[PDB]
């Protein structure tokens, strides 16, 4: 069947295997559990194609860095995700934009600007910045919450047509 390769990249913290887990596993994980590198394949069924969807859910750790360039090189599209209550994770979300396009060679690879926690109250950025920077990128806009599902299959689909148009 037709594979997409997503891979999910971000700071530490901002959600990234909540997402993944809410989208393959049906629930949130309210827990501490940090990602070295972890790989989810699931098939399913997208605007009634049946696809595979191999994901690589990614750590944010400040080192592994190097881990990085090689999953960048191999990955299809990518679900750049931050925080919406964590202005630094938003700050850095465009550090690894510029990855993606220098390790692909590329300012036309496949990608969503995802704010997660959209649950939380004490939100420190605000949708209308998230919107310039996927903007000038030439990129979606989505925000997520992994909690309460909401927005988490519309991050995930959108990529995958993101990559069906390209
Ligand atoms: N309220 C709320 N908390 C969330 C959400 N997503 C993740 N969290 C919480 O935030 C923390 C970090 O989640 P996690 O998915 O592990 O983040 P990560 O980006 O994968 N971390 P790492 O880079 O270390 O792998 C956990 O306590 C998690 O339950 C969300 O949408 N809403
Ligand atoms: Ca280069
Ligand atoms: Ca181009
Ligand atoms: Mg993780």
Same mark, same amino acid.
């Given at each position: +069947? *037709?594979? @997409?390769?997503?891979?999910?990249?971000?700071?530490?913290?901002?959600?990234?295997?909540?997402?993944?887990?809410?989208?393959? /596993? %049906?629930?949130?994980?309210?827990?501490?559990?940090?990602?070295?590198? =972890?790989?989810?394949?699931?098939?399913?069924?997208?605007?009634?194609?049946? &696809?595979?969807?191999?994901?690589?859910?990614? $750590?944010? /750790?400040? #080192? @592994?860095?190097? +881990?990085?360039?090689?999953? +960048?090189?191999?990955?299809?599209?990518?679900? &750049?995700?931050?925080?919406? %209550? %964590? *202005?630094?994770?938003?700050?850095?979300?465009? /550090? @690894?934009?510029? /990855?993606?396009?220098?390790?692909?060679?590329?300012? =036309?690879?496949?990608?969503?600007?995802?704010?997660?926690? &959209?649950?939380? $109250? $004490?939100?420190?950025?605000?949708?209308?910045?998230?919107?310039?920077?996927?903007?000038?990128?030439?990129?979606? @806009? !989505?925000?997520?919450?992994?909690?309460?599902?909401?927005?988490? #299959?519309? $991050?995930?689909?959108?990529?995958?047509?993101? !990559?069906?148009?390209?």
């Amino acid at each position: +069947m *037709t594979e @997409y390769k997503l891979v999910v990249v971000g700071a530490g913290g901002v959600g990234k295997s909540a997402l993944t887990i809410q989208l393959i /596993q %049906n629930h949130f994980v309210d827990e501490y559990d940090p990602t070295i590198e =972890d790989s989810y394949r699931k098939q399913v069924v997208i605007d009634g194609e049946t &696809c595979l969807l191999d994901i690589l859910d990614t $750590a944010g /750790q400040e #080192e @592994y860095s190097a +881990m990085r360039d090689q999953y +960048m090189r191999t990955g299809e599209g990518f679900l &750049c995700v931050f925080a919406i %209550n %964590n *202005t630094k994770s938003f700050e850095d979300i465009h /550090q @690894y934009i510029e /990855q993606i396009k220098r390790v692909k060679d590329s300012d =036309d690879v496949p990608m969503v600007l995802v704010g997660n926690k &959209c649950d939380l $109250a $004490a939100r420190t950025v605000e949708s209308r910045q998230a919107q310039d920077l996927a903007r000038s990128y030439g990129i979606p @806009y !989505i925000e997520t919450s992994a909690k309460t599902r909401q927005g988490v #299959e519309d $991050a995930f689909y959108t990529l995958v047509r993101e !990559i069906r148009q390209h």
